[PDB]
Symmetry: D2
Subunit: 242 residues, 4 copies
């Protein structure tokens, strides 16, 4: 369990991030949600998680494309929740196109959110975690942080950058009660159609779910994973095995 | 929880294997212990786990150096336990020496146990798991299954082979409710301790059988249904640099 | 030999880049040098290679921290040299500090040059190489593009990013007579902490490696990394 | 010395090394025929090379067989064979070449693994496993010879459209390309290239 602990999950207003925030809340961790979408639906999710799990849940609408806003999210989490034990850097965006046709604006945006926000979040969290003698940085990368796919140059580059940054984070904090790891998901979600689309990269022909990724984050945040650091955990149904 | 499931752990009469068997027993899984040791000591361990965790625990001392003995362990597990949901290939041995001075005897011994045993054990279990529509093969490799160190060629070669074998197992079982992964541990066990770990383990802290047991429990969980054909490094940063 | 071929090497005014530009010139390739340092020395180098190897050697001092400038380097290279067969993205900088103490300005500068310049240069070169039906993109990453070291977050992240970008480049050009690879050097001048051989890597060796990747013997070597680190990544 | 150089890649590498002016010692089924499936023969072919050739500077372990079948149907017979040659031979060959090279103060061990020494494919458990084994063995060899003038590396080839599934380049790799690669690895430019792999797979492992 994670009672008494505080977890900040970027881009948790929906999808994978919400699945992770939910799983952590279910372990008794207080949560700080983040991301965009419909404000009423967001408040419903925030209020609902707090009630369903008996934990404190706040919403911070910080725009992660801005370095200072990312750092502010972490520092405010500490001010309001009293500490920060788990930081899940999850928010990300995508754009497909040949390298020569890839807009510089899109390249910069993907690098800023998918990679630099990991830097800014981590930088702000580390001083608190070191003083706490406890920390868990969980970066949601991708199978594309380990291998490549055509037409996703910026995304692949940024995700590879995250895996490398994660390793450095682990080395700088080794032995200080802090670990840093990167979860690398395969595809996340007519049955014939689905299996056909997954056939290309995902051998299991099964989609990875937000609940499964949430369970993986919960494991990394547990004491059993105290010595799991600077590594990647592939949840890709065999994507990278071949 | 793993109530109603049966887990076979090779080389579990002590150390890491026992740590894994214990964590699995704590989740409610019936256990099949394996390995060598003192009859009384082993029985104390076996009876103790069964009583403490309220599950059935069998002990099979099959010598895993022989391929038929390995498959026999699995068959005997299904025969006596009724099924096999989880197989943890853990048994292993080591021998240090330069390549030109590495006894061929030792080379063949390390490969037979550290690698071929995984093949034999896996072959025997798959038929049952495929029929059940569920299975978890957890191979305990090592950091040396990903990187290397001087004077341990057979060990490193075997461990690498295990990683490769794990991926194939995963590919052949994809989507059939069966996963296969390899846990790659770093140093497993104050100033001296740190000095000894300083060379390979950044954390300067040992990995524990309990932690590896918790890692096996995670891999056997439903949250890990889509984690297959990969490695989980529990090395305190060993492989990050 | 690379007679009739044009190679552009970023950051070739010294160290590794110069070692690679030189090695490629010795193979008959025309060269476009780039980078900073002393102007008089740069001219001596440029004229010296052209005369000593009998090839056209040009100098373009484009500041590669600027995307448009990188694209301009390649386009002007096609204008003045007539073609571009080899693109060696080598230019890079470094900064060391704990992540929490790492200046945002340094993180941005390292990503801009060490990673984004590889994108801009590749983006500009591809249209030409595809039309030509030939191309060789060689990115100089680092052992830090495969593993990490404490206090070098921006550098390690950027190098890893380069390794990944190289893989995508290879896949988008697969089979079009174009290959994209990354050379990952170890230390280049206690060396025992990272490099087992206890021997530094040299610009000459790296140059020789670039020549091979540029040769036809490596026509099917693409989307991979070639470690020249004396055992760094082995352990 | 180039094992399994009686044809295919082994011959391609053998050839390429010839065009460079290095005395060659062929093998398979000077010339030798030692059965590499026997650690006895393998170790012999090496020492027999330094005997009749005067010395050994480049050892290329290329011998290897294949067999496909689900793991549970994979004959223990085949498994042991694929392992015996595809992997154990590299240990025997290398074990017999090190004392010589170390004394010579120079050496180039070139193991011919496969893309299957880095990734895997269904129904090739024994081959994939021995290949990964080669990669690991190659790395240990380097660490034990680091700074002694000897390097150990592994070439991991792809297919040598029916390759659409594994090779995006959709083009086969050739024995000469592999030969040139071997030539390069033997080059003085590869003095610091040790303990690593070189993938020649048209982008196989990149995705
Ligand atoms: N979808 C997949 O199958 C898949 C594959 C593996 C890796 N990934 C990675 O998983 C993570 C989650 O992806 P997802 O599929 O749940 O996506 P999603 O779009 O469902 O969720 C992204 C979240 O990011 C937030 N966000 C975006 N830009 C932001 C900004 N500037 N500031 C603050 N918040 C911002 C959104 O509000 C949203 O809640 C991403 O990092 C992605 O790259 C996803
Ligand atoms: N301890 C470490 O630091 C470390 C590092 C990473 C990897 N490893 C791996 O961890 C695993 C467990 O090692 P450990 O350190 O717990 O050692 P251990 O000696 O404590 O346990 C090994 C077990 O294997 C059993 N065994 C040995 N030969 C056998 C045979 N022929 N048949 C059946 N059982 C046999 C023994 O009876 C024993 O219970 C091994 O696979 C090892 O390679 C250990
Ligand atoms: N030990 C090592 O030296 C080592 C380790 C492995 C990787 N690396 C990488 O090798 C590559 C070559 O660097 P080096 O070690 O020869 O160092 P160097 O400083 O001698 O060479 C770097 C070159 O980059 C050029 N440069 C810098 N900023 C530029 C800009 N804005 N625009 C255009 N050119 C610019 C310089 O003028 C110089 O010629 C770098 O990418 C570096 O990160 C070096
Ligand atoms: Mg792959
Ligand atoms: Mg290492």
């Amino acid at each position: 369990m994670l009672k008494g602990k505080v977890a900040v999950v970027t881009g948790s207003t929906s999808g994978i991030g919400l699945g992770i925030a939910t799983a952590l809340a279910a372990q008794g961790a207080d949560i700080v949600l983040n991301g965009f979408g419909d404000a009423a639906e967001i408040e419903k999710v925030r209020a609902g998680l707090a009630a369903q799990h008996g934990v404190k849940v706040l919403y911070d609408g910080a725009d992660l494309s801005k370095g200072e806003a990312v750092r502010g999210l972490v520092d405010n989490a500490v001010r309001q929740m009293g500490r920060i034990d788990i930081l899940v850097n999850n928010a990300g965006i995508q754009h497909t196109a040949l390298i020569e046709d890839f807009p510089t604006e899109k390249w910069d945006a993907i690098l800023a959110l998918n990679l630099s926000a990991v830097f800014h979040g981590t930088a702000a969290a580390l001083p608190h975690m070191k003083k706490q003698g406890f920390g868990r940085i969980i970066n949601i990368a991708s199978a594309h942080g380990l291998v490549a796919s055509a037409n996703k140059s910026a995304y692949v580059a940024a995700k590879h950058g995250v895996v490398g940054f994660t390793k450095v984070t682990a080395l700088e904090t080794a032995g200080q009660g802090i670990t840093a790891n990167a979860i690398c998901p395969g595809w996340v979600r007519q049955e014939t159609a689905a299996r056909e689309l997954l056939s290309e990269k995902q051998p299991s022909l099964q989609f990875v779910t937000p609940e499964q990724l949430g369970g993986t984050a919960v494991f990394l945040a547990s004491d059993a994973a105290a010595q799991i650091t600077g590594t990647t955990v592939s949840v890709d149904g065999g994507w990278t095995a071949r």
